[PDB]
Amino acid sequence: GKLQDVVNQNAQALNTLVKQLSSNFGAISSVLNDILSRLDPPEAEVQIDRLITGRLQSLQTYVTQQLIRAAEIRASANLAATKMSECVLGQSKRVDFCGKGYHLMSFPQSAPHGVVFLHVTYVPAQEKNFTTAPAICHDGKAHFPRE
Amino acid sequence: RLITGRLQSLQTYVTQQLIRAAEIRASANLAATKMSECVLGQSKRVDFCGKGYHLMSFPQSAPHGVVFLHVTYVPAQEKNFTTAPAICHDGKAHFPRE
Amino acid sequence: AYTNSFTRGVYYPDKVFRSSVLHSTQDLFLPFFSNVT
Amino acid sequence: ESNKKFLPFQQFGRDIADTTDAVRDPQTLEILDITPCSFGGVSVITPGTNTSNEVAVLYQDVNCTEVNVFQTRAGCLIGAEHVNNSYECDIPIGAGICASYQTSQSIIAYTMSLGAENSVAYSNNSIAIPTNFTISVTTEILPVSMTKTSVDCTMYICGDSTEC
Amino acid sequence: AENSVAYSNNSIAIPTNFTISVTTEILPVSMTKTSVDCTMYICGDSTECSNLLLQYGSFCTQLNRALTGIAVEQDKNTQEVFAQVKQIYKTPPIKDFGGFNFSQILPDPSKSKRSFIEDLLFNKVTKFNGLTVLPPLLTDEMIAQYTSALLAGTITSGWTFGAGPALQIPFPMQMAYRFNGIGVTQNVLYENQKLIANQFNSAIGKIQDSLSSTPSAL
Ligand SMILES: *[C@@H]1O[C@H](CO)[C@@H](O)[C@H](O)[C@H]1NC(C)=O
Ligand SMILES: *[C@@H]1O[C@H](CO)[C@@H](O)[C@H](O)[C@H]1NC(C)=O
């Protein structure tokens, strides 16, 4: 749903861009030839001005939302480029970066406009209670485990 | 004239909201990362979880935010010494293990 | 003679009631620390 | 019936946003508070039509007196039972209320629970050590690119129009 | 301030003591879920204005879509940060954590079941046109229930609870693991546990003062 959500957002933004052609923006008609034929050039210029200004903003808005959206994808392409340098091309020690567990390795899989990481992690299981001791004394000296 | 003036005033507000909300998402992704790596495990990334040698961190909530208390170990009271890369005892070089 | 109008000359420019507000308005006010004849 | 104490000569009331708030009645010199009559949005809480066609309607920021009828912080919830239990969130609503379609079956509206309780048997000499393991393989999906779309000025705005 | 290290080719400096300093980092995570209506803001109670607005098409079918996506995301931001642990952990009724004192960060039942420090942060930081502010999905009582699970899980289990089944370990012993992870042997902590517990407790206490003294911290 992450890669699909990217596709829908772009298509809806483009469809909204097209459908804005069927708006008067305070002019008489939304068709360029209809307003041209119906009226005289001295008057059609005002109606031409109303449409183009309405269509400039509609094009201006689309690019701005594209610049904001494209910067949201660059922050995901920089994370995926980082999850491949550190998870795939080496073993990670950053917690929850390459999956929930103790990271072992990862395998990239491509996808349409995206990438899928399969994070192989080692998960402990079957815990058992025990009794611990910071150190043990045998000959009047304290012994600490090495590892 | 009014509605066009009010459309732009509403259009501007949303655009500055989209730019500002993307500045908060870059802080919610950092705080989510400072909790996976500082709180839920001990970090070895320098100055990520506080200035020092990281030991542990404790999250504290706040209104529209989060506060991390980064427990770090700071060395102190340095003393000069004289060092040696290796020492020779029987014609062989000895290097420290750790 | 001339004298210094320290802080006086301030009036209510309207009827409205404002509670704990630093309202800023432009109207004909007596300039602060002016010279009263 | 307000509570502000206007000055003797004052007939208006205003907020920081220069919006009219209180008025003094000219006939009886009593101050009146003005609150705009309730507005908001309507949201339809529904399980999938693949499951059922029974929906619950929420009116945002309403005291239920302006519209079986549950009143929350998000607004007046109509058509959803209120349960005193607490399950995982299914459909978010707000302020911790999550509605879900469950057992016949209808739409409930509970306060979501923050996971299953657990308390670690912690002492000052007890340690737990794993004895086995599992090799779990999880999947992470990340978008990396978009569609390279370009739009022409002349063709989009003034398609086939020299005058434009 | 100027400083020049007394550097030679056989001189090395080695620390002999240490301090356990506890620093504070503040990060914004969410905003207010604000929505604005087209008809009410632009043409509030005006049929004539509303009819002419329809000529612009769907300019503000987008704006209600843009402002909603922000709001549904502001709830994701809060969910990624806190909602990371599954089981809601709890501290034991006893508090003998090797001599370490967590009362200033752990919830106290003498209150909003927040802690001492969380309350300092909450005390410190403090419509006619379709400006509807939506409520956050996770109320602040749930969020502070989440940070107690992380606090209680860390104290009793260490880092073993974010990686799988939660395995308990004494807090005096867990810090020996943490010390051993920065190049310092275990016996440094055990031999100086009494000093270290006081250093940890003293440093935590200064946190409340540092927020309480100056209000520019948050
Ligand atoms: C005006 O004010 C100044 C200083 O504020 C004072 O010296 C002077 O006497 C006043 N009067 C005139 C007529 O300048
Ligand atoms: C709704 O109105 C009732 C009057 O019966 C009042 O007591 C109550 O506080 C109101 N509730 C809200 C949530 O505004």
XYZ file of C-alpha atoms and ligand atoms in Angstrom:
692
model
C 0.000 0.000 0.000
C 3.025 2.261 0.272
C 3.982 2.052 -3.405
C 0.355 2.089 -4.509
C -0.383 5.210 -2.469
C 2.338 7.002 -4.425
C 0.713 6.021 -7.726
C -2.772 7.141 -6.711
C -1.585 10.505 -5.390
C 0.131 11.365 -8.661
C -2.777 10.273 -10.863
C -5.345 12.151 -8.778
C -3.196 15.281 -8.947
C -2.985 14.951 -12.729
C -6.698 14.230 -13.127
C -7.496 17.287 -11.029
C -5.157 19.249 -13.301
C -7.076 18.126 -16.389
C -10.556 18.596 -14.931
C -9.655 22.197 -14.086
C -9.913 22.871 -17.821
C -13.701 22.613 -17.411
C -13.962 25.682 -15.186
C -15.016 29.175 -16.179
C -13.004 31.127 -13.575
C -15.614 33.855 -13.929
C -15.600 33.791 -17.736
C -18.546 32.979 -19.996
C -17.450 29.656 -21.507
C -14.758 27.101 -20.718
C -14.024 26.424 -24.407
C -11.447 28.686 -26.023
C -12.994 28.673 -29.497
C -16.523 29.235 -28.172
C -15.576 32.416 -26.317
C -13.564 33.526 -29.356
C -16.381 33.100 -31.879
C -19.232 34.312 -29.667
C -17.753 37.725 -28.848
C -15.553 40.392 -30.468
C -11.781 40.616 -29.893
C -12.119 43.801 -27.787
C -14.364 41.911 -25.339
C -12.989 38.376 -25.727
C -9.638 39.651 -24.434
C -11.136 40.195 -20.977
C -12.739 36.747 -21.042
C -9.448 35.341 -22.332
C -7.657 36.997 -19.411
C -10.027 35.448 -16.870
C -9.429 31.924 -18.185
C -5.642 32.103 -18.503
C -5.216 33.545 -15.008
C -7.457 30.766 -13.733
C -5.385 28.242 -15.667
C -2.068 29.729 -14.526
C -3.001 29.228 -10.877
C -4.244 25.704 -11.594
C -0.884 24.921 -13.191
C 0.950 26.845 -10.476
C -0.745 24.834 -7.738
C 0.024 21.501 -9.384
C 3.759 22.152 -9.583
C 3.933 23.305 -5.965
C 2.239 20.142 -4.714
C 4.641 18.214 -6.954
C 7.672 19.883 -5.386
C 6.413 19.058 -1.901
C 5.579 15.484 -2.894
C 8.843 14.897 -4.748
C 10.720 15.961 -1.616
C 8.776 13.338 0.330
C 10.035 10.675 -2.094
C 13.621 11.900 -1.958
C 13.501 11.369 1.794
C 12.402 7.774 1.083
C 14.982 7.200 -1.648
C 17.672 8.386 0.759
C 16.400 6.008 3.428
C 16.231 3.055 1.040
C 19.716 3.916 -0.216
C 20.804 3.907 3.435
C 18.996 0.697 4.290
C 20.884 -0.943 1.434
C 24.326 0.338 2.343
C 23.923 -0.715 5.970
C 21.461 -3.610 6.057
C 22.239 -5.387 2.776
C 25.918 -4.522 2.225
C 26.915 -5.270 5.807
C 25.417 -6.263 9.134
C 23.727 -3.566 11.200
C 23.870 -2.848 14.916
C 21.267 -0.070 14.864
C 18.162 -1.204 16.711
C 14.973 -1.664 14.675
C 16.703 -0.236 11.602
C 16.827 -3.521 9.693
C 13.786 -5.214 11.194
C 12.714 -6.036 14.736
C 15.195 -8.515 16.192
C 18.947 -8.921 16.054
C 19.927 -8.231 12.466
C 21.577 -10.990 10.454
C 21.271 -9.978 6.778
C 18.838 -8.536 4.258
C 17.961 -9.215 0.638
C 16.622 -6.483 -1.661
C 13.714 -7.173 -3.969
C 12.722 -4.645 -6.579
C 9.147 -3.453 -7.025
C 7.336 -0.929 -9.233
C 8.638 2.491 -8.158
C 10.021 1.008 -4.973
C 12.083 -1.611 -3.200
C 11.325 -4.375 -0.705
C 13.833 -5.423 1.949
C 13.585 -8.866 3.534
C 15.239 -8.390 6.917
C 16.572 -11.704 8.233
C 16.733 -11.292 12.010
C 17.535 -13.615 14.900
C 14.872 -13.594 17.624
C 15.576 -15.222 21.011
C 12.969 -17.638 22.291
C 12.198 -20.025 25.154
C 13.565 -18.004 28.047
C 14.365 -19.785 31.311
C 14.666 -18.264 34.771
C 18.006 -18.520 36.548
C 19.804 -17.107 39.581
C 22.612 -14.655 38.870
C 25.589 -13.346 40.772
C 27.762 -10.295 40.026
C 30.887 -12.187 41.097
C 32.040 -15.278 42.977
C 34.678 -15.557 45.704
C 36.868 -18.653 45.889
C 40.197 -17.698 47.507
C 39.262 -14.362 49.023
C 39.292 -12.789 45.546
C 36.413 -11.705 43.315
C 35.917 -13.393 39.935
C 34.065 -11.690 37.077
C 33.085 -13.476 33.856
C 35.090 -12.569 30.779
C 32.224 -12.773 28.263
C -12.802 40.236 -6.289
C -13.352 39.032 -2.719
C -13.526 35.298 -3.430
C -10.380 35.354 -5.566
C -8.673 37.254 -2.764
C -9.965 34.693 -0.277
C -8.996 31.725 -2.462
C -5.368 32.849 -2.528
C -5.416 33.505 1.219
C -6.670 29.956 1.750
C -4.318 28.634 -0.924
C -1.310 30.218 0.767
C -2.216 28.847 4.190
C -2.372 25.244 3.004
C 0.943 25.515 1.166
C 2.728 26.816 4.258
C 1.032 23.995 6.174
C 2.368 21.370 3.776
C 5.888 22.754 4.106
C 5.597 22.978 7.891
C 4.048 19.532 8.297
C 6.984 18.074 6.368
C 9.329 19.754 8.844
C 7.550 17.939 11.688
C 7.598 14.592 9.907
C 11.371 14.916 9.721
C 11.348 15.418 13.512
C 8.908 12.583 14.183
C 11.146 10.287 12.146
C 14.178 11.396 14.140
C 12.429 10.947 17.485
C 11.184 7.541 16.340
C 14.808 6.744 15.474
C 16.208 8.122 18.707
C 13.829 5.803 20.544
C 14.617 2.664 18.583
C 18.359 3.182 18.970
C 18.915 5.192 22.148
C 16.098 3.917 24.376
C 15.551 0.372 23.060
C 19.253 -0.448 22.939
C 22.639 1.137 23.500
C 24.042 3.354 20.759
C 27.540 3.599 19.328
C 26.812 6.570 17.062
C 28.708 9.606 18.298
C 26.664 12.530 19.639
C 23.448 10.800 18.570
C 22.247 10.053 22.100
C 23.918 12.916 23.934
C 27.500 14.123 24.220
C 29.536 11.422 25.948
C 29.654 7.651 25.773
C 26.047 6.514 25.638
C 24.708 4.331 28.434
C 20.894 4.502 28.207
C 18.028 6.922 27.680
C 14.582 7.413 29.170
C 11.723 8.960 27.178
C 9.472 11.552 28.751
C 6.365 12.704 26.962
C 5.526 16.371 26.458
C 2.777 18.359 24.725
C 3.199 17.658 21.001
C 6.676 16.318 21.606
C 9.031 14.034 23.475
C 11.994 14.566 25.794
C 14.916 12.140 25.902
C 17.149 11.999 28.972
C 20.437 10.694 27.599
C 22.453 8.994 30.345
C 26.072 9.181 29.196
C 29.404 8.268 30.765
C 31.944 11.104 30.645
C 35.618 10.428 31.460
C 37.239 12.743 33.967
C 40.487 13.370 35.853
C 42.972 12.535 33.124
C 46.560 11.734 34.095
C 49.656 11.922 31.910
C 51.596 8.724 31.289
C 54.359 7.387 29.053
C 53.298 4.923 26.369
C 55.031 2.323 24.264
C 53.785 0.570 21.109
C 55.355 -2.707 22.240
C 57.868 -4.156 24.690
C 60.712 -6.592 24.018
C 61.615 -9.192 26.635
C 63.156 -12.213 24.871
C 63.926 -10.688 21.498
C 60.209 -10.749 20.636
C 57.677 -7.919 20.469
C 54.689 -7.935 22.834
C 51.465 -6.075 22.025
C 48.628 -5.614 24.527
C 45.526 -7.690 23.921
C 42.975 -5.085 25.055
C 5.078 78.829 29.032
C 5.584 75.206 27.974
C 5.281 71.932 29.878
C 5.920 68.235 29.221
C 2.825 66.058 28.773
C 4.336 62.886 30.208
C 1.734 60.199 29.649
C -1.701 61.875 29.568
C -3.976 62.349 26.576
C -5.191 58.798 26.004
C -8.840 58.045 25.311
C -11.079 55.203 24.222
C -11.324 55.276 20.408
C -14.462 53.099 20.437
C -17.185 51.549 22.591
C -16.038 47.913 22.298
C -14.820 45.966 25.320
C -11.484 44.157 25.252
C -10.162 42.075 28.137
C -6.415 41.527 28.594
C -5.546 42.516 25.023
C -2.757 44.711 23.655
C -4.773 46.315 20.880
C -2.964 48.523 18.369
C -4.992 51.271 16.706
C -4.308 54.309 14.538
C -6.238 57.432 15.545
C -5.567 61.020 16.636
C -3.730 60.693 19.949
C -1.658 63.155 21.935
C 2.002 62.332 21.183
C 3.890 61.105 24.223
C 6.257 63.481 26.021
C 5.015 66.389 23.923
C 5.040 70.123 24.648
C 1.779 71.410 26.118
C 1.503 75.184 25.744
C -26.575 35.157 29.806
C -22.990 36.389 29.931
C -20.589 37.023 32.810
C -18.319 39.812 31.531
C -18.602 43.216 33.211
C -18.610 45.836 30.467
C -17.639 49.436 31.100
C -20.475 51.975 31.455
C -20.055 53.316 27.911
C -19.262 50.070 26.073
C -21.703 48.287 23.777
C -19.455 45.807 21.923
C -17.257 42.829 22.669
C -14.278 41.516 20.734
C -11.673 38.750 20.816
C -8.024 38.732 19.772
C -9.015 37.883 16.192
C -11.272 40.982 16.070
C -14.384 38.800 16.033
C -17.566 39.974 17.724
C -18.006 38.119 21.005
C -20.353 39.910 23.417
C -23.099 42.510 23.064
C -24.806 44.733 25.626
C -28.569 44.775 25.163
C -29.698 48.392 24.596
C -33.091 47.961 26.270
C -32.017 46.017 29.360
C -28.373 46.791 30.061
C -27.352 43.127 30.265
C -24.308 41.637 28.554
C -24.863 38.657 26.244
C -22.343 36.053 25.115
C -22.344 35.110 21.431
C -21.289 31.633 20.320
C -21.812 30.625 16.665
C -24.363 27.868 16.272
C -22.757 24.476 15.877
C -21.128 23.441 12.610
C -18.637 20.812 11.605
C -18.364 17.731 9.455
C -20.125 14.409 9.024
C -18.098 11.201 8.972
C -19.511 7.757 8.193
C -17.949 4.980 10.264
C -18.297 1.725 8.374
C -16.938 -1.786 8.064
C -16.376 -2.898 4.511
C -19.348 -3.562 2.284
C -17.638 -6.930 1.858
C -18.860 -7.484 5.444
C -22.016 -5.438 6.027
C -23.992 -2.367 5.002
C -24.588 -1.087 8.550
C -22.882 2.252 9.186
C -22.494 4.635 12.112
C -22.478 8.410 11.690
C -20.344 10.813 13.716
C -21.053 14.536 13.901
C -17.839 16.323 14.799
C -17.881 18.862 17.648
C -21.585 18.667 18.526
C -23.424 18.167 21.829
C -25.897 15.584 20.369
C -28.756 18.080 20.854
C -28.546 19.665 17.389
C -28.830 16.675 15.051
C -27.662 4.380 20.391
C -26.432 7.971 20.736
C -22.940 8.057 22.255
C -21.282 11.384 23.056
C -17.475 11.513 22.838
C -14.789 14.177 22.609
C -14.752 13.931 18.814
C -18.501 14.506 18.595
C -21.921 12.887 18.661
C -21.698 9.241 17.587
C -25.005 7.935 16.232
C -25.646 4.298 15.436
C -22.858 2.630 17.417
C -23.101 0.790 20.719
C -20.810 1.812 23.565
C -18.966 -1.105 25.161
C -17.190 -0.980 28.518
C -14.436 -3.311 27.259
C -11.262 -2.226 25.455
C -9.894 -3.898 22.323
C -7.312 -3.026 19.699
C -8.140 -0.048 17.515
C -10.062 -0.933 14.349
C -11.503 2.377 13.135
C -10.037 5.486 14.801
C -12.365 8.255 15.913
C -10.499 10.519 18.310
C -9.478 10.992 21.930
C -8.865 7.266 22.237
C -12.238 6.083 20.928
C -12.109 3.351 18.284
C -15.227 1.857 16.714
C -15.281 -1.701 15.422
C -17.733 -4.153 13.866
C -18.131 -7.195 16.098
C -20.763 -9.475 17.640
C -26.106 -10.500 16.103
C -23.120 -8.371 15.105
C -23.269 -4.582 15.254
C -20.953 -1.573 15.490
C -19.449 -0.824 18.897
C -17.476 2.181 20.149
C -14.923 1.388 22.849
C -11.832 3.061 24.290
C -8.792 1.491 22.666
C -6.299 -0.509 24.715
C -2.546 0.060 24.533
C -1.517 -3.543 24.045
C -1.640 -6.597 26.265
C -0.485 -6.193 29.854
C 2.776 -7.753 31.015
C 4.913 -7.404 34.138
C 8.453 -8.760 34.176
C 9.302 -10.975 37.152
C 12.150 -8.704 38.203
C 14.276 -9.373 41.285
C 17.798 -8.431 42.319
C 19.240 -11.891 41.647
C 16.959 -13.348 38.946
C 18.069 -13.355 35.308
C 16.297 -14.914 32.326
C 18.301 -16.465 29.500
C 16.966 -17.790 26.178
C 17.590 -21.404 25.252
C 16.404 -21.537 21.620
C 15.795 -19.034 18.833
C 13.872 -18.335 15.663
C 15.094 -16.878 12.373
C 12.303 -14.491 11.401
C 12.281 -12.727 8.030
C 10.275 -9.502 7.822
C 9.377 -7.345 4.829
C 9.864 -3.594 4.418
C 8.481 -1.637 1.460
C 9.809 1.806 0.515
C 8.888 4.113 -2.391
C 11.915 5.271 -4.339
C 10.664 7.171 -7.393
C 7.670 8.769 -9.091
C 6.473 9.235 -12.668
C 8.504 11.739 -14.665
C 5.607 13.943 -15.763
C 6.081 17.133 -17.765
C 3.398 19.651 -18.723
C 3.619 22.204 -21.517
C 2.535 25.810 -21.000
C 1.178 26.689 -24.430
C -0.687 23.440 -25.043
C -2.280 23.218 -21.594
C -3.414 26.836 -21.244
C -4.031 27.995 -24.827
C -4.276 24.765 -26.798
C -4.464 25.755 -30.477
C -5.158 29.459 -29.970
C -2.857 32.135 -31.365
C -4.799 34.934 -29.662
C -4.504 33.257 -26.256
C 38.247 29.070 24.828
C 41.728 28.260 23.566
C 43.325 24.904 24.337
C 46.409 23.085 23.061
C 46.879 19.396 23.806
C 50.275 18.459 25.245
C 50.975 16.063 22.393
C 54.221 14.102 22.112
C 55.202 10.845 20.443
C 55.306 8.864 23.696
C 52.855 10.696 25.987
C 49.345 9.325 26.514
C 46.661 10.618 28.877
C 44.299 8.201 30.604
C 41.254 9.072 32.736
C 41.102 7.857 36.315
C 37.523 8.732 37.329
C 34.265 9.489 35.534
C 30.934 11.247 35.772
C 27.477 10.006 34.798
C 25.920 13.036 33.114
C 22.266 13.060 32.057
C 21.322 15.495 29.290
C 17.920 16.471 27.918
C 16.784 16.509 24.286
C 13.433 17.936 23.177
C 11.876 17.060 19.814
C 8.527 18.086 18.284
C 6.524 15.123 17.054
C 3.098 16.402 16.000
C 0.979 19.462 15.253
C -2.667 20.440 15.677
C -5.035 18.652 13.312
C -6.683 21.750 11.847
C -9.263 21.597 9.068
C -10.828 24.540 7.238
C -14.066 24.484 5.265
C -14.335 26.120 1.847
C -17.929 27.329 1.867
C -17.960 28.646 5.428
C -14.613 30.445 5.235
C -15.049 32.121 1.843
C -18.816 32.628 1.505
C -20.105 32.247 5.051
C -23.912 32.300 4.828
C -24.194 33.565 1.252
C -25.994 31.582 -1.437
C -24.977 34.036 -4.167
C -21.293 33.756 -3.243
C -21.528 29.968 -3.019
C -22.971 29.628 -6.527
C -20.215 31.690 -8.148
C -17.567 29.704 -6.250
C -18.574 26.612 -8.228
C -17.096 28.179 -11.373
C -13.587 27.573 -10.024
C -14.178 23.818 -10.212
C -12.664 21.774 -7.389
C -10.048 24.139 -6.006
C -11.144 23.426 -2.453
C -12.021 19.809 -2.908
C -8.226 19.701 -3.001
C -7.761 21.835 0.105
C -9.981 19.626 2.244
C -7.943 16.746 0.829
C -4.607 18.447 1.516
C -5.460 19.462 5.079
C -6.824 16.008 5.867
C -3.696 14.195 4.719
C -1.711 16.369 7.102
C -4.081 15.491 9.937
C -4.142 11.739 9.328
C -0.335 11.912 9.225
C -0.026 13.851 12.485
C -1.513 10.766 14.130
C 1.011 8.517 12.427
C 3.892 10.635 13.724
C 2.725 10.077 17.286
C 2.200 6.363 16.640
C 5.673 5.687 15.225
C 7.423 7.365 18.150
C 5.672 5.875 21.169
C 3.702 2.854 19.935
C 6.813 0.735 19.515
C 6.375 -1.789 22.332
C 3.626 -4.400 22.308
C 3.089 -5.511 25.922
C 2.438 -2.794 28.512
C 5.212 -3.468 31.017
C 5.243 -2.433 34.669
C 7.857 -1.911 37.320
C 7.855 -4.304 40.272
C 6.211 -3.018 43.457
C 9.667 -3.010 45.048
C 12.222 -0.397 44.006
C 15.596 -1.937 44.907
C 17.285 -1.279 41.574
C 20.786 -1.669 42.960
C 20.459 1.735 44.585
C 19.366 3.707 41.518
C 16.469 6.126 41.947
C 13.893 6.487 39.157
C 11.139 8.261 41.089
C 11.603 11.450 39.072
C 10.938 9.704 35.743
C 8.586 6.863 36.731
C 4.838 7.438 37.161
C 3.657 8.285 40.617
C 0.204 7.340 41.954
C -0.011 10.630 43.890
C -1.588 12.455 40.939
C -3.025 12.397 35.213
C -0.787 9.463 36.144
C 2.307 11.233 34.846
C 5.690 11.401 36.550
C 7.517 14.210 38.297
C 9.423 15.399 35.226
C 6.604 14.887 32.719
C 4.445 17.292 34.724
C 7.070 20.040 34.549
C 6.975 19.755 30.761
C 3.179 19.864 30.704
C 2.796 22.790 33.102
C 5.407 24.837 31.255
C 4.022 24.620 27.712
C 0.571 26.196 27.479
C -13.843 29.429 14.987
C -16.487 31.430 13.171
C -15.170 30.425 9.724
C -14.929 26.656 9.698
C -11.729 26.442 11.763
C -12.329 22.993 13.207
C -9.517 21.532 15.317
C -9.666 17.756 15.370
C -8.661 15.881 18.530
C -5.581 13.646 18.521
C -6.322 9.942 18.330
C -4.028 9.125 21.266
C -4.963 11.235 24.257
C -2.116 12.392 26.484
C -3.078 9.814 29.097
C -2.463 7.053 26.546
C 0.842 8.557 25.429
C 2.111 8.701 29.000
C 0.933 5.109 29.370
C 3.178 4.277 26.423
C 6.292 5.973 27.800
C 5.817 4.115 31.084
C 5.916 0.817 29.201
C 9.212 1.863 27.621
C 10.526 3.154 30.939
C 9.452 0.057 32.860
C 10.665 -2.321 30.163
C 14.093 -0.679 30.063
C 14.545 -0.805 33.833
C 13.684 -4.483 34.277
C 14.799 -6.023 30.964
C 17.322 -3.676 29.326
C 17.510 -3.875 25.561
C 16.062 -7.391 25.446
C 12.458 -6.212 25.159
C 12.760 -4.367 21.861
C 14.402 -7.368 20.235
C 12.125 -10.249 21.223
C 10.852 -11.850 24.404
C 11.473 -9.620 27.414
C 14.186 -11.153 29.602
C 14.699 -9.631 33.039
C 18.115 -8.835 34.496
C 19.121 -6.990 37.696
C 19.700 -3.295 37.149
C 23.013 -3.409 38.962
C 24.076 -6.109 36.482
C 22.544 -4.507 33.384
C 24.660 -1.387 33.822
C 27.695 -3.665 33.786
C 26.557 -4.673 30.310
C 26.192 -1.006 29.372
C 29.609 -0.204 30.840
C 31.138 -3.182 29.039
C 29.757 -1.778 25.780
C 31.791 1.431 25.947
C 35.165 -0.231 26.521
C 35.086 -0.211 30.338
C 35.280 -3.543 32.145
C 32.512 -4.852 34.377
C 34.464 -4.588 37.625
C 34.674 -0.802 37.287
C 30.936 -0.535 37.916
C 30.723 -3.161 40.665
C 33.597 -1.714 42.666
C 32.093 1.787 42.379
C 28.375 0.995 42.320
C 27.657 3.178 45.346
C 29.386 6.179 43.775
C 27.720 5.589 40.402
C 24.217 5.299 41.851
C 24.669 8.671 43.547
C 26.012 10.231 40.346
C 23.026 8.942 38.385
C 20.562 10.149 41.021
C 22.157 13.581 41.387
C 22.249 14.183 37.633
C 18.571 13.277 37.242
C 17.594 15.771 39.932
C 19.246 18.641 38.076
C 16.942 17.929 35.123
C 13.867 19.167 36.972
C 15.692 22.312 38.079
C 17.052 22.970 34.590
C 13.528 22.896 33.172
C 12.036 24.635 36.217
C 14.603 27.447 36.372
C 14.558 28.691 32.772
C 11.349 28.504 30.732
C 13.214 28.676 27.402
C 14.186 25.001 27.689
C 10.991 23.840 25.952
C 9.650 71.826 23.914
O 10.229 70.710 24.549
C 11.625 70.845 24.742
C 12.196 69.513 25.183
O 11.202 68.519 25.111
C 11.892 72.004 25.714
O 13.268 72.256 25.882
C 11.269 73.281 25.164
O 11.341 74.337 26.083
C 9.797 73.057 24.817
N 9.181 74.211 24.209
C 9.553 74.827 23.066
C 8.708 76.013 22.681
O 10.497 74.485 22.369
C -24.602 19.682 26.367
O -25.684 20.421 26.878
C -26.020 20.044 28.196
C -27.372 20.623 28.552
O -28.257 19.587 28.912
C -24.877 20.489 29.109
O -25.118 20.140 30.452
C -23.603 19.777 28.669
O -22.474 20.228 29.372
C -23.334 19.976 27.179
N -22.268 19.106 26.770
C -21.211 19.479 26.030
C -20.227 18.376 25.732
O -21.045 20.617 25.621
